[PDB]
Amino acid sequence: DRPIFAWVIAIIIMLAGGLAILKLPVAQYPTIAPPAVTISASYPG
Amino acid sequence: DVITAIKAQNAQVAAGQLGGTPPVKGQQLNASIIAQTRLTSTEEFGKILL
C-alpha cells in the first residue's frame, strides 16, 4: 500500500465535507413537532 | 311568509359587549351581551309568530 493515492482520498473526504458545511446557516433543531395545520375564523361582536 | 318568519325568529345574532374595547378609563367590568339564541326543540318551533 503506497501513500500518494490515500493522501488524495483524504482530500476528497476533506472537500466533500467542506462543501457540506456550507449549509450555513445551520438551524439548531431537527423538526420534532407532529404537523400542526390550523384553521381560524373571526366573527366580530 | 313561513320561511321569512323562521330566519327572523330562529337566528343566532351577535351583539358586542359591556366595557367594549376602546373603553372609558375607570371601567370596572367587561361582559358579553347575548340577544337571540338558536332554537332547540319542536315546541319552540311551534311558537313562531306569523
Side-chain angles (χ1 to χ4, degrees), chain A:
Chain A
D1 295 305
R2 318 108 294 165
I4 202 78
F5 194 86
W7 227 18
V8 169
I9 303 299
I11 263 73
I12 304 160
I13 308 299
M14 205 97 177
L15 269 291
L19 263 287
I21 206 78
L22 261 70
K23 288 286 164 286
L24 155 142
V26 196
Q28 36 165 177
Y29 312 121
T31 302
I32 348 266
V37 173
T38 316
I39 325 148
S40 59
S42 185
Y43 188 20

Side-chain angles (χ1 to χ4, degrees), chain B:
Chain B
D1 305 333
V2 173
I3 294 159
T4 314
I6 302 159
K7 57 254 283 291
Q9 292 182 53
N10 185 34
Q12 189 87 355
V13 293
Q17 55 186 134
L18 287 161
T21 31
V24 180
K25 274 77 76 69
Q27 189 71 53
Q28 300 299 309
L29 66 149
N30 180 242
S32 59
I33 278 93
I34 314 296
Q36 293 182 43
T37 181
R38 221 150 207 171
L39 297 165
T40 184
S41 60
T42 177
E43 191 178 28
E44 291 186 349
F45 272 86
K47 291 179 181 180
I48 275 87
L49 188 73
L50 289 150

